[PDB]
Design an enzyme around this catalytic site. Structure first.
Site, PDB file in Angstrom:
ATOM      1  CD  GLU C  63      30.179   3.034 -74.268  1.00  0.00           C
ATOM      2  OE1 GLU C  63      31.232   2.393 -74.036  1.00  0.00           O
ATOM      3  OE2 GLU C  63      30.035   4.228 -73.947  1.00  0.00           O
ATOM      4  CG  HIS C 163      28.621  19.832 -58.437  1.00  0.00           C
ATOM      5  ND1 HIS C 163      29.325  18.763 -58.950  1.00  0.00           N
ATOM      6  CD2 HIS C 163      27.369  19.739 -58.949  1.00  0.00           C
ATOM      7  CE1 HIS C 163      28.542  18.073 -59.760  1.00  0.00           C
ATOM      8  NE2 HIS C 163      27.349  18.639 -59.768  1.00  0.00           N
ATOM      9  NE  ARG C 176      20.486  18.927 -62.118  1.00  0.00           N
ATOM     10  CZ  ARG C 176      20.290  18.479 -60.891  1.00  0.00           C
ATOM     11  NH1 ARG C 176      21.096  17.586 -60.327  1.00  0.00           N
ATOM     12  NH2 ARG C 176      19.286  18.987 -60.206  1.00  0.00           N
ATOM     13  CG  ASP C 185      23.685  -1.125 -57.223  1.00  0.00           C
ATOM     14  OD1 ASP C 185      24.705  -1.876 -57.157  1.00  0.00           O
ATOM     15  OD2 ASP C 185      22.916  -1.126 -58.192  1.00  0.00           O
ATOM     16  CB  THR C 213      31.675   7.524 -69.429  1.00  0.00           C
ATOM     17  OG1 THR C 213      32.262   8.376 -68.424  1.00  0.00           O
ATOM     18  CG2 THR C 213      30.754   8.363 -70.311  1.00  0.00           C
TER      19      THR C 213
HETATM   20  C1  HEM Z   1      24.301  19.688 -66.225  1.00  0.00           C
HETATM   21  C2  HEM Z   1      24.926  20.474 -65.343  1.00  0.00           C
HETATM   22  C3  HEM Z   1      24.863  20.131 -63.834  1.00  0.00           C
HETATM   23  C4  HEM Z   1      24.203  20.815 -62.890  1.00  0.00           C
HETATM   24  C5  HEM Z   1      23.350  22.095 -63.048  1.00  0.00           C
HETATM   25  C6  HEM Z   1      24.428  20.145 -61.629  1.00  0.00           C
HETATM   26  C7  HEM Z   1      23.897  20.524 -60.417  1.00  0.00           C
HETATM   27  C8  HEM Z   1      23.825  19.726 -59.298  1.00  0.00           C
HETATM   28  C9  HEM Z   1      23.146  20.020 -58.048  1.00  0.00           C
HETATM   29  C10 HEM Z   1      22.351  21.317 -57.799  1.00  0.00           C
HETATM   30  C11 HEM Z   1      23.323  18.967 -57.221  1.00  0.00           C
HETATM   31  C12 HEM Z   1      22.831  18.783 -55.761  1.00  0.00           C
HETATM   32  C13 HEM Z   1      21.422  18.230 -55.590  1.00  0.00           C
HETATM   33  C14 HEM Z   1      21.066  18.265 -54.111  1.00  0.00           C
HETATM   34  O1  HEM Z   1      21.142  19.357 -53.485  1.00  0.00           O
HETATM   35  O2  HEM Z   1      20.711  17.209 -53.526  1.00  0.00           O
HETATM   36  C15 HEM Z   1      24.135  17.981 -57.922  1.00  0.00           C
HETATM   37  C16 HEM Z   1      24.551  16.756 -57.430  1.00  0.00           C
HETATM   38  C17 HEM Z   1      25.453  15.863 -57.973  1.00  0.00           C
HETATM   39  N1  HEM Z   1      26.081  15.998 -59.202  1.00  0.00           N
HETATM   40 FE1  HEM Z   1      25.610  17.509 -60.568  1.00  0.00          FE
HETATM   41  N2  HEM Z   1      25.245  19.044 -61.857  1.00  0.00           N
HETATM   42  C18 HEM Z   1      25.539  19.007 -63.200  1.00  0.00           C
HETATM   43  C19 HEM Z   1      26.335  18.064 -63.820  1.00  0.00           C
HETATM   44  C20 HEM Z   1      26.974  16.977 -63.243  1.00  0.00           C
HETATM   45  C21 HEM Z   1      27.887  16.060 -63.893  1.00  0.00           C
HETATM   46  C22 HEM Z   1      28.281  16.172 -65.382  1.00  0.00           C
HETATM   47  C23 HEM Z   1      28.275  15.124 -62.997  1.00  0.00           C
HETATM   48  C24 HEM Z   1      29.254  13.948 -63.214  1.00  0.00           C
HETATM   49  C25 HEM Z   1      28.874  12.674 -63.260  1.00  0.00           C
HETATM   50  C26 HEM Z   1      27.621  15.424 -61.747  1.00  0.00           C
HETATM   51  C27 HEM Z   1      27.734  14.734 -60.570  1.00  0.00           C
HETATM   52  C28 HEM Z   1      26.948  14.913 -59.448  1.00  0.00           C
HETATM   53  C29 HEM Z   1      26.913  14.018 -58.324  1.00  0.00           C
HETATM   54  C30 HEM Z   1      27.697  12.700 -58.153  1.00  0.00           C
HETATM   55  C31 HEM Z   1      25.917  14.636 -57.350  1.00  0.00           C
HETATM   56  C32 HEM Z   1      25.526  14.075 -55.967  1.00  0.00           C
HETATM   57  C33 HEM Z   1      26.082  15.057 -54.938  1.00  0.00           C
HETATM   58  C34 HEM Z   1      25.899  14.600 -53.517  1.00  0.00           C
HETATM   59  O3  HEM Z   1      24.742  14.560 -53.042  1.00  0.00           O
HETATM   60  O4  HEM Z   1      26.914  14.273 -52.860  1.00  0.00           O
HETATM   61  N3  HEM Z   1      26.844  16.549 -61.938  1.00  0.00           N
HETATM   62  N4  HEM Z   1      24.405  18.480 -59.174  1.00  0.00           N
END
Ligand code: HEM
Ligand code: HEM
Ligand code: HEM
Ligand code: HEM
Ligand code: HEM
Ligand code: HEM
Lengths: 229, 228, 230, 230, 230, 228
Positions: C63, C163, C176, C185, C213
């Protein structure tokens, strides 16, 4: 390296570097500053068989630079070596690089005998006629997506539009085109010499119908001498 | 070694562009003349860990004087080399301008399966020039319109990309690294050639992402050039 | 009592992420003073063993804008603050600029719960990391736009199901962890990932594509500081 | 000056100043640094009949500040005098001003008994019931031309939409509004105290469904300065 | 010769506003040298008694970007320049950077004149300030956009009648003075206000809602300098 | 050889405008060295009597970004350059940064000529400056956009007639001088005004709507003002 030959050939590399003197240049001992000209003169002679060197004065005419080099070379690496070694010089150590432009000379793409014979003949029939030029202008040019989208036929028509009002200015203005795409963050380096800056302003206005660099033409040791003072 | 690692998928590339600090001129001449050997020993120390390429940009670039390309099977080993380089005499006197991290991958589009004609063209083209003297590095970030498109749409576009570029493969070597998620760009494109006119023509062919242009040397020669 | 396996698994847990860039005068610190920096940090972490969980990662060599960063987890945000403030008083802390600070809090599932999305919720539970200990960390802060917040809860849930569908497969090789930042923030989320397989992570991000990142390596805190003292 | 009275009246000025310690604070003699807290404590006491002083610690939680003051005063010029005099202090001389916000307290414009009796009653029936708050949040707010274009009736309906989901949080979040238009380059300064940052994140999300957020911890002024001398 | 009540009341008078921020090395100026700065400025003003009217205002403690500012009024702009240049050679002047310089001229009414708008013009005359001496100053430069300049004189007059209608009421509490800057500076107007009642001023700006703001306090020049020497 | 009334009146004359800001270390220059700065500049101007016309203006106290500026007029741009570079080697010159440099050339009337616009051209000839020698200078560089340059010559002429119509009245109170810059600098025009009546200038700019401001002195007086 023969000046009249290299400046006339395709496949020739042009390296343009604009320098601004650092505030602490004034703090360099006056004797060390007064020796800077000869040091540059010897460097240029050392590279006599390697590169053609032009050095221009911009101090007093430009906010962002005090001088710039145009190096022409058959081998870009030789141009690089000269510039690198200049930067190790007394004055070189006391100057920041403002801008570096790399381009290469090429055969006519548009206004050739085959593609545009009328304007091509005009390009050859026009010869510079005043006094040795006192002034240099360098303008880098980057073309947009619209230009590159266009067909070769459409670009040729635009280049014929470019060439039509500009041929008359060749009695008064010398031009040289370098091509930069892939070699630098611009598409072309346009290079002009003239003794008549009013003609140059009219030329630009004829075309209107980037960063401009304006400097004066001198021997390299005179440029350095002017900067030592 | 070199011929193998530069030819496999799953290989990490770390590109780091450096700018000499103004106080480099103030380092004692003897200390500066020892810098090359120090870098040579560091590279030899990491002979089994990473492949090191070092290139000269001074005299051709405003924003950098040299840059490394490190290839490694293990990203952490590339990191270790780069960190240790930065503790070196010259490394302590250089600022990092840019750091790019990417990974090598199998063909996504112009594969035997998806695009057999152009894939065959990619294999039948072989570099035929002298040893390349020049390097070009161009980071690429694609926009939302690209990622919106279907796999089929993206394939068609990559076929458009490949068609006019095959001709340059005799003259220009290319290597693609993938960066999405690993860095703030999508791709690092890497090129070597002896013929910069060909390279200019290639980019124009494509026209119809800041560019770094440098020169290929042994690492000790690059450092020697910067010590003077 | 801070148990790593427990605190990293609960709701209401605070995460403080601070990225540091070594000052140029760090090279001028006496070599023996620099060689003692690792032990000082080790003792500070020990001192706060009942107060916070400390992770320290190496970013130097990968970085431009940071050399290392901390992730502090805590039940009490003030305790995380105290640790970070005391770290900045250390030998190495005094010779490092703060590039970035992110504060967030862990929360129960809002969308992909048993109640709202039982199929995908079951997939979230049935997926288990099976790789070696992760060598790499990725941190990505995320701010959502007006259009997101405009949408109905039903529309946001459908998007979260979009997603989750292609990402479940990656849980065998990518860990994760989500922190929520709105009001705490200038971002909405801090996303945090661990992996040994950066090719999988690149594929994951591409699966999603279809802010900044931070990539670093995972080590013991004293090893990170030792690496920076050299 | 009585804390409970001044914090509860209209026509009261708030001056918020966020400070970042200069790098040469570390080079101030340690005994000079250790005397900084008493110096600030005496200044506050000298102004005990002039201004109310709050001092908060942001170091370890914020990149751009180490501490900030909130000064409340009936008389703005007295708040200015205190702040000027603070800047002459040992620690004040070693700190840059990152941000200064000036606002004034006013009667209810929208959710008054007259204009919105239902929600006004809810505003008064809600009472903070938590422990003494450990956390402070400050958020400056500038409204756009669309807001100001709207009729008083339309703005009132929007403010009723604002108030409806937020009443719930008043048991564990304290709020205070300052008005800044014409006095500064913003429209409002919003000020919150809580012990429960989970509730505060939930509150901001309830609302989501120009503004940099400052998060800090509440302490005695001397304890904040002592923390910064270390 | 120059009489305050006359010059502040005439068309064709030049205003030069210059906002200054103290350099960090002001603290390093010997204390006796700093304590002599007030008398030096007092003598300079006295020297130019017949040349310019001088006001000096304290912004330190209320503004991030300035510590003090001058308003110079003069019949001859060159005399205002001479004063400002000479101030800049004083002890404190040598230790302060110029943040902002605004140049404008006083003019007769363009819009709300007896001839063009007799009703509102009479309201303008019938309103007089009745407070105690103002303690506060506000300066706001204003640049109008192409849409404004494109409008007809009749359209601009109607807008200025809209401007004047709700603002007349505030003239009992707020002093206003307009300077015209187009062609003299990179703005169109310098608006200048004095008040003892900042709540009224906030109300006024909100009345209008339905460039950057400088707020300071009114004092004798020597008191302002004394306040900065400490 | 150069005559003020002649060179300021001719086509083909070059104007070089350079705005300077005094460095903080100017206050640290010995008082006697500072007090000799005015005579140094006076001697330099005298030395170049036959090469260029020199105007020096005071902006300190009226501008944040500059303390003084030069307007150099010359038949030979290179001679303007020589003066300016030699000024920069002066005691005061060594202690000032260049904020802005503008290069332009004087030209015949392009639009409001006898041939193209005889009525307004006659008005140009008939409105002359009256009253006291101007105390004030205003310099405004102007860059026209693509919309302007794509317009026809006829359309641009009509616009220039719109420009000239309400401005003629102001020539009794304001002197104007136009320099043309396209191709010579990163702007299209340098506009130059002198007036004793800043209210008139304000009204003029307002008439147009429907900036460097300085004061005019002898060069030695400007330097003396800055030495204090
Ligand atoms: C490793 C694989 C991943 C899985 C299985 C996954 C799954 C999920 C799930 C189930 C939630 C919702 C949690 C809730 O219901 O409150 C979530 C939220 C979120 N994920 Fe992932 N995710 C993954 C990877 C990523 C990646 C690579 C990013 C990019 C930075 C990301 C960005 C986000 C963000 C910003 C939220 C917040 C959503 C919201 O509440 O508006 N995710 N993820
Ligand atoms: C002095 C009078 C000029 C003449 C006679 C002239 C003529 C030409 C000709 C014949 C070409 C075609 C080169 C080819 O066939 O590959 C060309 C290209 C070009 N000219 Fe000029 N030109 C003049 C002045 C200028 C000026 C003042 C500019 C402004 C910077 C300019 C910008 C360019 C550019 C950017 C190209 C490359 C266009 C392309 O290949 O896409 N020229 N010119
Ligand atoms: C030397 C001649 C070149 C050839 C034969 C060539 C061929 C290809 C091929 C076959 C691919 C697809 C790889 C895959 O299937 O995964 C590709 C990808 C790519 N190329 Fe080139 N290329 C050349 C030069 C260039 C140049 C000059 C650039 C400009 C920077 C460039 C930019 C890219 C980028 C960014 C990708 C990744 C595209 C994506 O996956 O969306 N290439 N190239
Ligand atoms: C703690 C729970 C909260 C409650 C009970 C609440 C309630 C209210 C009420 C009743 C008003 C109208 C005051 C009046 O009539 O003059 C108001 C105004 C306002 N609130 Fe909140 N609020 C809360 C939290 C927040 C938050 C988290 C923010 C975001 C920064 C916020 C931003 C604002 C702003 C900017 C105004 C001024 C609106 C205007 O007059 O244009 N409030 N609030
Ligand atoms: C104190 C109550 C105020 C009153 C009675 C008032 C009244 C007026 C009047 C009568 C004019 C017309 C001057 C003329 O005819 O030439 C005017 C102009 C103007 N006012 Fe105010 N004003 C007040 C406050 C404000 C405020 C708070 C601002 C915002 C900074 C403001 C901004 C302006 C500006 C920029 C102009 C010049 C408009 C133009 O000529 O285009 N005024 N005002
Ligand atoms: C003092 C009263 C003024 C008069 C009588 C006047 C008149 C003129 C005339 C007759 C021309 C055309 C010259 C030609 O035909 O070649 C011209 C050009 C121009 N004027 Fe003015 N002017 C005045 C003030 C101003 C002002 C205050 C500005 C603003 C900076 C200005 C900006 C310009 C510019 C940029 C041009 C070049 C236009 C072009 O060739 O595209 N003028 N003026």
């Amino acid at each position: 390296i023969e000046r009249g030959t290299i400046l006339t050939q395709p496949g020739v590399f042009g390296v343009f570097t604009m320098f601004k003197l650092r505030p602490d240049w004034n703090k360099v001992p006056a004797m060390e500053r007064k020796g800077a000209a000869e040091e540059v003169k010897k460097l240029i002679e050392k590279h006599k068989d390697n590169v053609l060197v032009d050095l221009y004065l911009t101090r007093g005419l430009e906010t962002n630079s005090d001088f710039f080099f145009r190096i022409n070379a058959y081998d870009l690496a030789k141009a690089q070596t000269f510039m690198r070694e200049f930067r190790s010089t007394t004055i070189g150590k006391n100057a920041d690089v403002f801008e570096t432009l790399v381009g290469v000379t090429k055969p006519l793409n548009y206004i050739s005998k085959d593609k545009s014979p009328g304007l091509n003949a005009g390009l050859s029939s026009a010869t510079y006629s005043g006094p040795a030029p006192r002034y240099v202008i360098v303008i880098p040019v980057k073309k947009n997506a619209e230009w590159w989208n266009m067909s070769p036929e459409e670009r040729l028509k635009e280049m014929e539009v470019h060439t039509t009002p500009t041929l008359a200015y060749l009695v008064n203005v010398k031009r040289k085109l370098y091509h930069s795409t892939g070699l630098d963050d611009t598409d072309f380096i346009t290079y002009f010499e003239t003794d008549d800056l009013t003609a140059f302003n009219n030329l630009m206005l004829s075309l209107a119908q980037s960063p401009t660099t304006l400097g004066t033409i001198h021997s390299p040791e005179d440029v350095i001498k002017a900067l030592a003072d």
